Amino acid sequence: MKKDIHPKYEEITASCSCGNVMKIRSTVGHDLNLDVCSKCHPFFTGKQRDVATGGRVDRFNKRFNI
Amino acid sequence: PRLGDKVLEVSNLRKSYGDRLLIDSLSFSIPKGAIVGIIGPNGAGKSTLFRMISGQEQPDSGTITLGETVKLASVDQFRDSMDNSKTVWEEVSGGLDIMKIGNTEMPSRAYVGRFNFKGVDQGKRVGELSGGERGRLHLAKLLQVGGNMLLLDQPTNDLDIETLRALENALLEFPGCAMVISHDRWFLDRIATHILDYQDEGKVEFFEGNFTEYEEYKKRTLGADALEPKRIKYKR
Amino acid sequence: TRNGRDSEAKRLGVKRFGGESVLAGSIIVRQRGTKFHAGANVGCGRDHTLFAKADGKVKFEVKGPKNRKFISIEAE
Amino acid sequence: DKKSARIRRATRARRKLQELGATRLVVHRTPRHIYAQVIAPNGSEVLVAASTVEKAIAEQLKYTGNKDAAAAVGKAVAERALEKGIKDVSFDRSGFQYHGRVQALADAAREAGLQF
């Protein structure tokens, strides 16, 4: 590369709540701990818990406990 | 920005350079919407006060407590910070056809024209400028931050009568707070509402009012001392 | 009447034609663009005028991938 | 493209040299071989031709296609040229930047009896 015109690149390591210790090549120099990560990835969760809108008759029928 | 009650109070301030103490145990609090004129001899710490206010320095004791709503805009004591190899318009705006003052933008050419720099006089290099024109341009360039705690360090450097009175009438309308450092008390006689008088030993005293009221204070608590000159001369 | 002005004629064109024996330095064509490009043994002035570079015969040719007319001088 | 944008890079020099009517020594570089030959002012018939694909020159070189190989060819083309009555030529860049193993090629020829 062109040298000495870039922020310094390294192989720093951060840690998550589910473990997730990876020597990720990043330019920080003082790692920042993180929240949930790819081992808690909301790609099998977010869309599955998205579906909660629609359906209110059953909401009313509970009121007919009389 | 709108500014509230806290106007950067100062508590137990003490300054020194080695052993040369400039200010010791200074404490005050500027009110809101005021103009504060600073008077004193040469090399008595007046520029040092602005230096420590603007974060350039640190206080050897006490602390200055900024207000969180305060926007800072301090004018350097010296014109020698421009680059003489640039045009007036480029120097002020930054080579942008539209710059911004405060929050609204408005065109750079109009912004400069508001300082009586017409389109023809736009093209002169800032190295080819009279003293008054250089002062006006430097003031125009620095006042574009759109702040509200204007720390003017002798804006009356090389200003004519009419040039001086233009700013003298513009300052009285300022919403924000204005702290002004100057040596010509006649300029301050028209605008100053609070007074910072320097003295010996590093004594700085606060006062609330104009210079006629300062004279009233002296006369109410007077002291007989007028023997100022001695005329040292140069040759034996 | 608003118009009614014009410029003096510049007298361009071909001055020596094909098969004409020229001397070195003689002007072959006075030009505005480059309708005729400089072949071998001819030059090209700042006014795009094509002048002979050696005495001989004038020869117009159509060499080139874009069919652009060339003038070159045969050595005789 | 490589070749398409390179031949147009060398057209100007190639045409100017043709106008001057001088014999030119042209170099063609390849990631595996390198070639150099001298072509008459006719532009059609050639006089001297040396290349790394030739067996004898490539036998002594470890890997044909580096700086060492080109200088061996660069010296070699000079050897043949001086035996064909040729002393004065004009080196042709042919599009390749005159920095690496084309600089090595011509420099050996320059030091081996070619006046350019």
Binding site: - | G123, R125, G127, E128 | - | -
Partner: protein, 50 residues
């Protein structure tokens, strides 16, 4: 017209100078180039003058 005539005096001390036109408004910096001085027969530096 805003370009005004200037003369490039020599720097070998002889009396010789070229002349040209220079925009004194947008180019306040003075000119100095290397030109031929046919009195001493050398390429000397020519500085800007009146």
């Amino acid at each position: 017209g805003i370009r005004e005539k200037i003369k490039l005096v020599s720097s070998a001390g002889t009396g010789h100078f070229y002349t040209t036109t220079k925009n004194k408004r947008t180019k306040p910096e003075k000119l100095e180039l290397k030109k031929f001085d046919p009195v001493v027969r050398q390429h000397v530096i020519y500085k800007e003058a009146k």
